[PDB]
Curated annotation (Swiss-Prot), chains B, D:
SUPFAM superfamilies (alphabetical): alpha/beta-Hydrolases (SSF53474)
Positions with a binding annotation for substrate: G41, G42, N50, N110, S179, R189, W265
InterPro entries with a match to the protein in the record: AB_hydrolase_1 (IPR000073), AB_hydrolase_fold (IPR029058), AB_hydrolase_sf (IPR050266), Epox_hydrolase-like (IPR000639), HOPD_hydrolase_BphD (IPR017727)
Alphabetical keyword list: Aromatic hydrocarbons catabolism, Hydrolase
Example GO BP: biphenyl catabolic process
Source species, domain of life: Bacteria
GO CC, any one term: membrane
GO molecular function annotations of the record: 2,6-dioxo-6-phenylhexa-3-enoate hydrolase activity; 2-hydroxy-6-oxonona-2,4-dienedioate hydrolase activity; monoacylglycerol lipase activity
Subunit structure: Homodimer.
Active site per database record: Q264 (proton acceptor)
Protein name: 2-hydroxy-6-oxo-6-phenylhexa-2,4-dienoate hydrolase
Keyword Hydrolase belongs to the record: yes
Effect of S111A: Catalyzes the tautomerisation of HOPDA. Extremely low hydrolase activity
Amino acid sequence: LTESSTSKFVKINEKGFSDFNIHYNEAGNGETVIMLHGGGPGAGGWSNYYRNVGPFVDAGYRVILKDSPGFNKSDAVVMDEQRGLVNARAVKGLMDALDIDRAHLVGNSMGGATALNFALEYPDRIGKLILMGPGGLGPSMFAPMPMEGIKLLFKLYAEPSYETLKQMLQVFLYDQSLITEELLQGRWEAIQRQPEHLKNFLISAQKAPLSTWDVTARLGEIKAKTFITWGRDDRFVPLDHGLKLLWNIDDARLHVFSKCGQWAQWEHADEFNRLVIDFLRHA
Amino acid sequence: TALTESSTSKFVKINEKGFSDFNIHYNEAGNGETVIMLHGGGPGAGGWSNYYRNVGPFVDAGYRVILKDSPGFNKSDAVVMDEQRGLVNARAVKGLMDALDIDRAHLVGNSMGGATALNFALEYPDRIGKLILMGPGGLGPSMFAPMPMEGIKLLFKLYAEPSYETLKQMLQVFLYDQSLITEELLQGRWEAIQRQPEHLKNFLISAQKAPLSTWDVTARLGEIKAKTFITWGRDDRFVPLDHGLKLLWNIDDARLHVFSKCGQWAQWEHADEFNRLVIDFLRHA
Amino acid sequence: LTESSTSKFVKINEKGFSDFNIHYNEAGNGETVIMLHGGGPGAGGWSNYYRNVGPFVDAGYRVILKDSPGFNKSDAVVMDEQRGLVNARAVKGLMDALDIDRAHLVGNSMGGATALNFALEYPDRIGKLILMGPGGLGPSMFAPMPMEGIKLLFKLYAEPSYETLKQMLQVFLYDQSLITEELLQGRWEAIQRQPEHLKNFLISAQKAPLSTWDVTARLGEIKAKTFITWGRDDRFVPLDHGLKLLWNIDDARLHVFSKCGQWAQWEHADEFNRLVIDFLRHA
Amino acid sequence: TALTESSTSKFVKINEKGFSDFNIHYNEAGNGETVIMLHGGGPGAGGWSNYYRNVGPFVDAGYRVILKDSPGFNKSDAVVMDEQRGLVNARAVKGLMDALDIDRAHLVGNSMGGATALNFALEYPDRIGKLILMGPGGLGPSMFAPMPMEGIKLLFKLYAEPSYETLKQMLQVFLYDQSLITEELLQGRWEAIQRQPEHLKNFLISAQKAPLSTWDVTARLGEIKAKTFITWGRDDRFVPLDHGLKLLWNIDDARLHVFSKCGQWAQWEHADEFNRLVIDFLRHA
């Protein structure tokens, strides 16, 4: 598989959306797994998930790497509501657009915020919920906020340098020497090719700051089977949120990877793949 | 051969440091790559009783499984120990491996058996493959939980005044869903208590000589070179959840998995998931 | 001072209350400190606070040891709403009853739940907020619930034995050999003399379980200056709630006492007294 | 006499283990019962710079206050250390106490000075009264926070490439309210960096010989017999909050106090409350 071969578009008309173009990548057939990416500059379905799409297809799954409204080759937008609840509507849109009655969601960071909102609003349309260091769960009992990674993320949004992006990625990864060009250019090309997303994000962050995303009091309402993954060394979202989810969602389990940043799916691909595939297959 | 507690039951004399001609009971099945499972420290614990829901699937996955009765438990020989039990138990595991000609084994350890597995990986790094830990005991204070924990107090209470009803109370604290407690489980533990009452008294004499605080190997976790799978039950009232994080941070190559709606026996209360996760870890980690 | 010398009653008519008799003890003059006791069988203003009333009066404070609706010499009742919100109304009642325009609150356990609700509903009537291991803040990130102390509390409510009460107190105190008769009889006489409170409590616990008391999502609304105290070895409410309060209340500080159970005010009287007096005097 | 940085400034030669005729700078005022205050480990740190908001009130409360410049900081003599800095610093504190005929002192320690205070209480239990710790360094891994922490990375960055703007970045991470950072604070630290650049390079050479992981005294906290007051800033990005709990659980007689809206300098960012709480602890604990 490649990005080219899998590339695809489709408009959506849910709630406040209307004739809104969502880019995505699709492969495989059958049961549907929608993978939702992180909030960083130049973030996209493919870029977040290029080590998990193949193995998930082989497992006999319909794999949808969605570009969320306002990133990569999807359409630009400005939100005055918390992006989790908004991205969920975009997801609900792409499912209605493509006749998908139900899907499993895999949400990393902002994505995980999306999946959590999707699961809260549209429970009848979610199968199983995989969360990987999801944002927007309020304050940590230990980490002061903003966290080091979030600081760097806004710094990159503000002054998109090549050297800055690099330093953002050295904080996102536990092992910094794992930095590939195919990754680094994937993000750097994505920021350049649509620099309207950057300014749109900062404005939205002004209208709905991270503190408004907190869905914590509603967690006792999530019914789907939940698999929470965390990188032990995540400098973007604090480890103790993993526990908050475990205690509040009725049916959850938590897996933490050592020597791992915010990208468990990337930095620990193999283990992540087989752990999640098995969770879908057997839980 | 049918796989039953009796058809798998075996004995081996071990000779290692402070053990001479010491009879160790174990249950064994399967062939090839070896997994040794080490049980908890409560009255009447033993290998079969802790691991009977795991043995079949591990054997079917192609492992040789050894459910070891630790010294001073169940059908192994009696002992009063004057050193910390994790280390003495690890000597016995090594003794059993030498006696059975086993060069390397994966270790699965629950509670006291987790402490055993950790001491074994510290002392005998060349003889361990992978390490699987389920809520290991004796890792010092918790950052949140007052000690002794509720499970620990019931453990000592049962050791000192054994009764069926106190056994039942203990087991109700050990498990998240107390309605899963069968009369057969209970009667198995109760028979082990009644058939080997010397183990209880010897345990109490030994704990006075080397209290639980002496089992703390925290300072050495940095030496462990085995790939490690830590499992915890979210609802464990015996050893606290923050110890799972302590191991995750101090062992070089670890992952942690926490089961919801689970007390201190994840291998038993969530056997199917446990089996699937650990088998997968042994095969592909 | 003694219980006799300070004993006093007054009816109240707030919201659902009407001609409802609140017992309390008062001493001293000037600025008002209302001390609110814990949820245990035979719990009462005096019994919780007999080492803190004298020293607080000397400090020049008006000290009100309130018996909460349904304990000790106050009137019996059954609640179908979480007792924190209900006890707050009773407190708001005793203040209107006695022409108190403002007060500082000192809440231990159930009391702390009260103070937190009082501070949320009636902020204009609260000065400064002292919380000592307050209940009803949801699940712990570490302790499974119900906690050992809560289990024992309901066991004592169910079968009020003298030996049972004793075992409840051995779990409430870090140092068990500190058990005094003047305490033990204070509780044992209180349970006997009004055994209707016991059954009323169990029914209310049925109508509004501990899980309904959680005010966590509203903590960002508390404006009063807050002093959170905790016993390190508290087996009734988990230590990590101390942190939750610290992070969520806008103006808070946290003090933890070593070798200390649920009764910081009792087990560490001196240090507690001077710490709180100074907080009132200078914060 | 007026109390100013200069009117209080003194030197004393110390001779203790690996120190011979080693000049220690300190600031001193007041008389009687002795409190020694030990500073942090960042570039340009020193006693005055860390504690100038505390000295007046402690002296007025009736204490003799000593703000000590640790070896290889500020106006004390230069040194490249080959052992963990907490212990070497504790030797220097003991050396200063012997040279000034001080039998017993209360110790207040911030960050590196907290590590110093802990080593001193371990090694010289008879020479300490009470122990006050503010976010002490080197207590090993955190259960929540990735390491090195953000403050630590800025510390090493500033040591290796000193610049005024990097100093400002560091100080902005140290403090909760960055708008409290005065030009005078900045210029004081910056002058100490520029006037003693050898301290920076010596610090880096020393940290290669005994890294921060070697400062961990966790395993010994159980030996500390001093009544201990632990203070933390909720918002500390240099040493993590769970270490406050680690000390609370492992030292026999401790209390913990956490200030909201506070980074790693509680003594400075919340001086008034800090002063009031610690003075009260010294008088009545």
